[PDB]
Amino acid sequence: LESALIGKPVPKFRLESLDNPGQFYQADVLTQGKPVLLNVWATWCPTCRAEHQYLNQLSAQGIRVVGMNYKDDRQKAISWLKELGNPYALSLFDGDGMLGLDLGVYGAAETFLIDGNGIIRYRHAGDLNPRVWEEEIKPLWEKYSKEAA
């Protein structure tokens, strides 16, 4: 559904890396100077596995994706990435769902488009498929990719 975060900066946070125990990241990691997709997922989310293959494809095309493991189990999450492939430039462990709370997600299966300056530009509640990418996100991704080049 709608998001009140459109046009606003990413919420402050300090989360641990999923595959790098003890390494912590903050909102600055989402200000890469280039647009980035923030994908919320979990091993218990059916739509998440479905869309995973498509994420691998976009990632292989240069689309920068940051993964946010939501209220999940690190081992299952890591095992999941080792089996299906890892498309994420970085993986954050939102074990308590605190970042998810500030982001206002309705659950797993959610993607946010963030511009080079860390501003949330779009929120898609649902699985990411070619239709959604083509018609709804791609046009924005291209705009902010150019307005950063």
Swiss-Prot record:
Disulfide bond as UniProt keyword: yes
* Taxonomic superkingdom: Bacteria
Q: What positions does the domain Thioredoxin occupy?
A: 4-142
For membrane topology, the record states:
Single-pass membrane protein
GO CC terms: outer membrane-bounded periplasmic space; plasma membrane
**Record GO biological process:** cytochrome complex assembly
Alphabetically sorted, this entry's keywords are: Cell inner membrane, Cell membrane, Cytochrome c-type biogenesis, Disulfide bond, Membrane, Redox-active center, Transmembrane, Transmembrane helix
Where does it localize?
Cell inner membrane
Which stretches of this protein does UniProt put in the Periplasmic compartment? 1-149
The keyword Membrane is annotated on this UniProt entry: yes
Q: What is its main location?
A: membrane
Give the disulfide map. C45-C48
Citing just one GO molecular function, the answer is: disulfide oxidoreductase activity
The family annotation for this protein states: Belongs to the thioredoxin family. DsbE subfamily.
Tell me the function of this protein.
Involved in disulfide bond formation. Catalyzes a late, reductive step in the assembly of periplasmic c-type cytochromes, probably the reduction of disulfide bonds of the apocytochrome c to allow covalent linkage with the heme. Possible subunit of a heme lyase. DsbE is maintained in a reduced state by DsbD.
Question: What is the name attached to this protein's record?
Answer: Thiol:disulfide interchange protein DsbE
